[PDB]
Write a protein that binds this ligand. Structure first.
Ligand SMILES: [Cl-]
Ligand SMILES: [Cl-]
Ligand code: NI
Ligand code: NI
Ligand code: NI
Ligand code: NI
Ligand code: NI
Lengths: 142, 145
């Protein structure tokens, strides 16, 4: 059956978001176990994080096979070119809108160090966008 | 200045949203890299994997500001200051997933006529239950000394 417009389409999206966060969280936690001398705990966090990678990738497989869009950008991700276009769209949103906006709010609320971080990130995502744009030119132009 | 209280601020909400987006970016770019791999684009795949390391650094930095600002884990709304608290956050999210989120997703998938997706969600419910048990075993290690 067609997944478009179903609740299952939404649940694959929110499964993807949670899986993505779980992998990042567990690898961040592992580095604390590392410094404190808990190699078995760190190893378990790393191995379970591989599980969450598998989960996230499986959600994306169903999304792509179903003709659903990228959770992050609402752009198709069927072909490699589409995947690069999805990357460009996300990076563009981040540098032109999201991170500058976060920076302005941080400065206005009295958090200059957080604002500086968001402005670093905006410059980083702009750099990423440019790099991906150069890939798209290669792919689209053969 | 790193320990300024962020509770209640719009900046707290923005750090959480930034962490979500960074998390997804790393997963997406490593997924895309595998498509570039099979098709024979190693420079594209390598760029995707290197940019993914950037998004790891971003995500981890967001987590640093979240913890230092006295904020909670974006995924679980639990404190993640100490290692013990980090494992308790892992257990809380695993518990939500196996007791509620994935079983509910599987029921809706079956109702909507997606039995293959339902089977996948059921597999994941069992997986997150196994993860919860293994983290519970570790926590008992930490608290026992
Ligand atoms: Cl250990
Ligand atoms: Cl290449
Ligand atoms: Ni998972
Ligand atoms: Ni980026
Ligand atoms: Ni300070
Ligand atoms: Ni980023
Ligand atoms: Ni899990």
């Amino acid at each position: 059956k067609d997944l478009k417009g179903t609740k299952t389409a939404e649940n694959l999206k929110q499964g993807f978001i949670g899986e993505s966060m779980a992998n990042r969280r567990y690898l961040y936690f592992a580095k604390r176990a590392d410094e404190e001398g808990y190699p078995e705990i760190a190893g378990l966090l790393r191995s379970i994080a591989e599980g969450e990678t598998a989960h996230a990738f499986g959600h994306l497989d169903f999304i792509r096979q179903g003709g659903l869009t990228d959770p992050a950008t609402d752009k198709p991700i069927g072909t490699l070119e589409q995947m690069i276009e999805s990357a460009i769209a996300g990076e563009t949103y981040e540098w032109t809108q999201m991170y500058p906006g976060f920076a302005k709010v941080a400065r206005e609320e009295g958090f200059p160090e957080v604002a500086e971080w968001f402005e670093t990130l905006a410059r980083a995502e702009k750099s990423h966008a440019e790099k991906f744009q150069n890939v798209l030119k290669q792919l689209k132009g053969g």
